[PDB]
Write a protein that binds this ligand. Structure first.
Ligand SMILES: [Mg+2]
Ligand SMILES: [Mg+2]
Ligand SMILES: [Mg+2]
Ligand SMILES: [Mg+2]
Ligand SMILES: [Mg+2]
Ligand SMILES: [Mg+2]
Ligand SMILES: [Mg+2]
Ligand SMILES: [Mg+2]
Ligand SMILES: [Mg+2]
Ligand SMILES: [Mg+2]
Ligand SMILES: [Mg+2]
Ligand SMILES: [Mg+2]
Ligand SMILES: [Mg+2]
Ligand SMILES: [Mg+2]
Ligand SMILES: [Mg+2]
Ligand SMILES: [Mg+2]
Ligand SMILES: [Mg+2]
Ligand SMILES: [Mg+2]
Ligand SMILES: [Mg+2]
Ligand SMILES: [Mg+2]
Lengths: 271, 66, 103, 88, 70, 117
RNA sequence: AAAAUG
RNA sequence: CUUGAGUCUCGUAGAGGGGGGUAGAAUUCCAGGUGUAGCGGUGAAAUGCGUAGAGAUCUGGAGGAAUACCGGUGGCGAAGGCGGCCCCCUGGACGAAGACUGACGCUCAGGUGCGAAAGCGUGGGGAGCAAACAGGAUUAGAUACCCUGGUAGUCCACGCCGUAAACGAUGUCGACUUGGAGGUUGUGCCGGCGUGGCUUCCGGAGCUAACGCGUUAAGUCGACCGCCUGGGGAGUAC
């Protein structure tokens, strides 16, 4: 549900929460947890290489099965869980042989539901199949780019991919970006859309909530001095320049993709 | 005029009966008006539904130019 | 239960799978306590217009009495079966145990 | 609408005979049955206003019949609203 | 209207057949009526006007049946 | 070039103009002429006579192909509907088929608004 | 085609 | 008590409503083949498109929106409204035999719900059309009509708005009062003769300022409600 907060303080007035009563209220499944300490956006030279990253809440990493390789063994959804590491919720599934795993939670999936993977799985949300065994036109998520590599496409909340065509060894996919791309038909996909589609309706409401997610403030180039940024300077608010990055590359329209290696798989750019 | 379905006690017109339905479409494949063939309104409605069902199953053409 | 008239059309190159398709579809119905009242294999026919760039298909007519759910399952089977290029499931007031104009 | 079997069952439960279809108890029970049944339909089909008009007609007719019975025989009214589980 | 010219059928006769086929199918009327959008209120008005005037012209007919002009 | 002996004439007869394309049976254009391109601009372009001259010019434009027979495909409501067919017959072609191909939607897209003249 | 006013 | 009102039984016709799926025609776009100098548009033009190959024609693909014919002073719905085909859920109406309840009815200020199109909010979608906007014409001017383009919007989900010449400019319910020709939908008997429901046209008495209405009344009565009181100012101000 999308819930508006009452304006009991100015930092609460514009808050819009996404509240999901289905989500587990207890602790996560410890065997599938790992530590994940923060970076501040600094690399192994100690330098900031991605600005505006730091702070926020401590998060444990959940090991999510993106490969969905355990073929032919049915599994049952035990519960749906909050995962701090991504926008999608995740589901703890118990396979018939006693193994437990986390998967991305598709839309509609609930505790008690059965899922399966393999060439002979039924065509139902949460089931994973090679895409040569999935009807053209189907809506899928967690799509592999290479066979056996693990899902890489359409993993964010509410995202999905359409299989628009199949031709010999490849399928054509319409991605959430609008790109039409080819991947080998032996690549796996999970039926349905990723759940939590209301994720985008949330409104942070205040600076502090962004800080909680570990986002540090963005300083505008124009508010700086020339030594700091091509946009800096001026007596008062001045611009008179073509907008650029802090490193001087045009940042309104200039295209940056340069991958001749992968160009053959792009049927049509996102437009 | 005179209505061939009233004079035969037809309960339903049977989209499967292609031979009968072909007398109620034109060369272009269009449903003939009931004012031309003299069909009663009740049977004209049954006949239109039957023709459309037969068109769906490709037992009759929508047009002469497929 | 409800009376349904079902016509399905098979890819003419999968004509030989049709006897088995009829056997499985009637097996599901009768396993749901359903009764086949009319069954007719019309065979390959000329399409009035092309479908999937085909000009022929193998028609099968069944008049069955079945619960709704097994008919839904049969429709999902039709949808996901690449051999069945078209189908139509209609309700009927009463059971139709007769001979069609095609036979 | 209610099937033949459910209607007959309600008549047998609340009437004096299988022929007692017109008694206020039978009518109120039949209306209550269909109203309760349509609760699920309108839970699914919230924008089915045209059908809801018929549902609200069932409601108001049940209210008028119940008030009639309350005027006629309060004992039969109390027994009926208790068996049917109606507030009033 | 698909006309196939028949053996020993001259060209003018095949042309007349094609013309009658087009008129029976009413292709030209369909194109004329479909050239511009006619609002539903306009269409209902025109249909009603056609029915009214047809009925009234038959009234005029059946009533001039009685009237002697000289 | 290659000889054909079996062609299709396509008559695009609009209210403002007439276009005659003679293709082979596979739809490959061999020649074409139009009323506008035949010395007729304006009030004269949308006349049956202009369409007839255009059809004559189109027949001359495919003479080298040795086309002997013609299926005629007539599209549109314009005045060059039949005068083109007469011209094609009178140029010695053997008309073996006359077909109307005016596209008719089975409802479809909304037409432009009516003109208030 | 345009075509106001008293 | 059974005649008003309702319940049950069997059946009938229906674009009644909600959800889901699907078919074929067509427009547009994208890719390619053939082909060559025009296309498009108007009262006449021009803008626009086209030798960077259009228009035309053929093939393959994408996508949205609407469902030709049937189709009808035809049908259904309280009104607004509702039109391909298929399924699922669902509302009402009508008819024939009976059986049942036994005045349980009618109307309704306030209240509550529904309520075309446009519009508004959030999220989608966007073919065609098209306010705004741009250009071309026309003209004395032309913030238009006409032309070439084109954005909201039209579409979907959910919420809001609550208004229309939302009209039959005719409130709801009931009774009574000569006819004629039709439509549509039941049903009884034997093409004919009956008998119900809804509906179109004409017309008699009567009514009406007249025009007209005329058994679906604007006739003759009864019940209840809404509303009017010269034109403007004004359905405006507060
Ligand atoms: Mg940043
Ligand atoms: Mg920012
Ligand atoms: Mg400074
Ligand atoms: Mg600098
Ligand atoms: Mg300054
Ligand atoms: Mg400056
Ligand atoms: Mg009822
Ligand atoms: Mg135009
Ligand atoms: Mg008041
Ligand atoms: Mg609207
Ligand atoms: Mg909007
Ligand atoms: Mg929107
Ligand atoms: Mg315009
Ligand atoms: Mg008003
Ligand atoms: Mg209205
Ligand atoms: Mg009125
Ligand atoms: Mg009024
Ligand atoms: Mg009332
Ligand atoms: Mg009158
Ligand atoms: Mg006001």
């Amino acid at each position: 549900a999308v819930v508006k907060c009452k304006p009991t303080s100015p930092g609460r007035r514009h808050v819009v929460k996404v509240v999901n009563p289905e989500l587990h209220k207890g602790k996560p499944f410890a065997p599938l947890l790992e530590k994940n300490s923060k970076s501040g956006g600094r690399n192994n030279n100690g330098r900031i290489t991605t600005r505006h990253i730091g702070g926020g809440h401590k998060q444990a990493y959940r090991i999510v099965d993106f490969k969905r390789n355990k073929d032919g063994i049915p599994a049952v959804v035990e519960r749906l869980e909050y995962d701090p590491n991504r926008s999608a919720n995740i589901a703890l599934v118990l396979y018939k042989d006693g193994e437990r795993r986390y998967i991305l939670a598709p839309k509609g999936l609930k505790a008690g539901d059965q899922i399966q993977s393999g060439v002979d799985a039924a065509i139902k949300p949460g089931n994973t199949l090679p895409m040569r065994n999935i009807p053209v036109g189907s809506t899928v998520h967690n799509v592999e780019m290479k066979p056996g590599k693990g899902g890489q496409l359409a993993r964010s909340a509410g995202t999905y991919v359409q299989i628009v065509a199949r031709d010999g060894a490849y399928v054509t996919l319409r991605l959430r970006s609008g790109e039409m791309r080819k991947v080998e038909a032996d690549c796996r996909a999970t039926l349905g859309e990723v759940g939590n589609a209301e994720h985008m309706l949330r409104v942070l409401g205040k600076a502090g909530a962004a800080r909680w997610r570990g986002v540090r403030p963005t300083v505008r180039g124009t508010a700086m001095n020339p030594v700091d940024h091509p946009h800096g300077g001026g007596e008062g608010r001045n611009f008179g320049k073509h907008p650029v990055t802090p490193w001087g590359v045009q940042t309104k329209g200039k295209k940056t993709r340069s991958n001749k290696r992968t160009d053959k798989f792009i049927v049509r750019r996102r437009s | 005029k005179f209505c061939r379905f009233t004079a035969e006690g037809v309960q339903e017109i049977d989209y499967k009966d292609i031979a009968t339905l072909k007398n109620y479409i034109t060369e272009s494949g269009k449903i003939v008006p009931s004012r031309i063939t003299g069909t009663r309104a009740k049977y004209q409605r049954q006949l239109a539904r039957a023709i459309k069902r037969a068109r769906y199953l490709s037992l009759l053409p929508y047009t002469d130019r497929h | 239960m409800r009376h349904y008239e079902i016509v399905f059309m098979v890819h003419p190159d999968q004509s030989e799978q049709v006897p088995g398709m009829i056997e499985r579809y009637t097996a599901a119905i009768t396993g749901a306590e359903g009764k086949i009242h009319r069954l007719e294999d019309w065979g390959r026919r000329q399409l009035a217009y092309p479908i999937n760039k085909l000009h022929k298909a193998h028609y099968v007519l069944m008049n069955v009495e079945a619960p709704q759910e097994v008919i839904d399952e049969l429709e999902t089977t039709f949808r996901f079966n690449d051999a069945v290029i078209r189908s139509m499931v209609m309700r009927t007031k009463h059971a139709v145990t007769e001979a069609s104009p095609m036979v | 609408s209610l099937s033949t079997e459910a209607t007959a069952k309600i008549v047998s439960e609340f009437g004096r005979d299988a022929n007692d279809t017109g008694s206020t108890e039978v009518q109120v029970a039949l209306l209550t049955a269909q109203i309760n049944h349509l609760q699920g339909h309108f839970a699914e089909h919230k924008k089915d206003h045209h059908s809801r008009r018929g549902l609200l007609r069932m409601v108001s007719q049940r209210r008028k019949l119940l008030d009639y019975l309350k005027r006629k025989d309060v004992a039969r009214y109390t027994q009926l609203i208790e068996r049917l589980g109606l507030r009033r | 209207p698909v006309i196939k010219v028949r053996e020993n059928e001259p060209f003018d006769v095949a042309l007349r057949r094609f013309k009658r086929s087009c008129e029976k199918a009413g292709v030209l009327a369909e194109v004329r009526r479909r050239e511009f959008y006619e609002k539903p209120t306009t269409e209902r008005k025109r249909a009603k006007a056609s029915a009214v005037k047809r009925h009234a012209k038959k009234l005029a007919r059946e009533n001039a049946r009685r009237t002697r002009l000289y | 070039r290659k000889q054909v002996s079996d062609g299709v004439a396509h008559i695009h007869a609009s209210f403002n103009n007439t276009i005659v394309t003679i293709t082979d049976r596979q739809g490959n254009a061999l020649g074409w002429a139009t009323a506008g391109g035949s010395g007729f601009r304006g009030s004269r372009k949308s006349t049956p006579f202009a369409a007839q001259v255009a059809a004559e010019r189109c027949a001359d434009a495919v003479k080298e192909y040795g086309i002997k027979n013609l299926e005629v495909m007539v599209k549109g409501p314009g005045p060059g509907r039949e005068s083109t067919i007469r011209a094609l017959n009178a140029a010695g072609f053997r008309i073996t088929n006359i077909t109307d191909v005016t596209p008719i939607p089975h409802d479809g897209c909304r037409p432009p608004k009516k003109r208030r003249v």
